[PDB]
């Protein structure tokens, strides 16, 4: 097309969110509960020590 | 502007009819009655001859 700004809106509509950033968000969300549990177990060990 | 076709419509709106063509139409319209009268007088002379 020759329409100014058509490429921007068409890319935006085609890709509401990039796949790579979506996957980064997914892996972060998957990892968060594991880190929470690990730190909770660390605090449990701190309780055990005292 | 960068909009395709904007120049065409803007020129069309700015100049509904060119001044030169408008003046040509005006002079033709002014001349027509004179030519009609001249040819009518020519026919009147043809009547006079016969």
UniProtKB/Swiss-Prot annotation, chains A, B:
The chain crosses the membrane at residues 22-42. Residues 1-21 are extracellular. It comes from the Eukaryota. Expressed at intercalated disks in the heart (at protein level). Expressed in the fetal cochlea. Changing residue 21 to H: In HSS; overlapping features with oculodentodigital dysplasia. Sumoylated with SUMO1, SUMO2 and SUMO3, which may regulate the level of functional Cx43 gap junctions at the plasma membrane. May be desumoylated by SENP1 or SENP2. It is found in: Cell membrane; Cell junction, Gap junction; Endoplasmic reticulum. A connexon is composed of a hexamer of connexins. Interacts (via C-terminus) with TJP1. Interacts (via C-terminus) with SRC (via SH3 domain). Interacts (not ubiquitinated) with UBQLN4 (via UBA domain). Interacts with SGSM3 and CNST. Interacts with RIC1/CIP150. Interacts with CSNK1D. Interacts with NOV. Interacts with TMEM65. Interacts with ANK3/ANKG and PKP2. Belongs to the connexin family. Alpha-type (group II) subfamily. Gap junction protein that acts as a regulator of bladder capacity. A gap junction consists of a cluster of closely packed pairs of transmembrane channels, the connexons, through which materials of low MW diffuse from one cell to a neighboring cell. May play a critical role in the physiology of hearing by participating in the recycling of potassium to the cochlear endolymph. Negative regulator of bladder functional capacity: acts by enhancing intercellular electrical and chemical transmission, thus sensitizing bladder muscles to cholinergic neural stimuli and causing them to contract. It is linked to Oculodentodigital dysplasia: A disease characterized by a typical facial appearance and variable involvement of the eyes, dentition, and fingers. Characteristic facial features include a narrow, pinched nose with hypoplastic alae nasi, prominent columella and thin anteverted nares together with a narrow nasal bridge, and prominent epicanthic folds giving the impression of hypertelorism. The teeth are usually small and carious. Typical eye findings include microphthalmia and microcornea. This is Gap junction alpha-1 protein.
């Amino acid at each position: 097309t020759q329409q100014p700004g058509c490429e921007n809106v068409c890319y935006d509509k085609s890709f509401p969110i990039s796949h790579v950033r979506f996957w980064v968000l997914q892996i972060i969300f998957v990892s968060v509960p594991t880190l929470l549990y690990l730190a909770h177990v660390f605090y449990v060990m701190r309780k055990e020590e005292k």
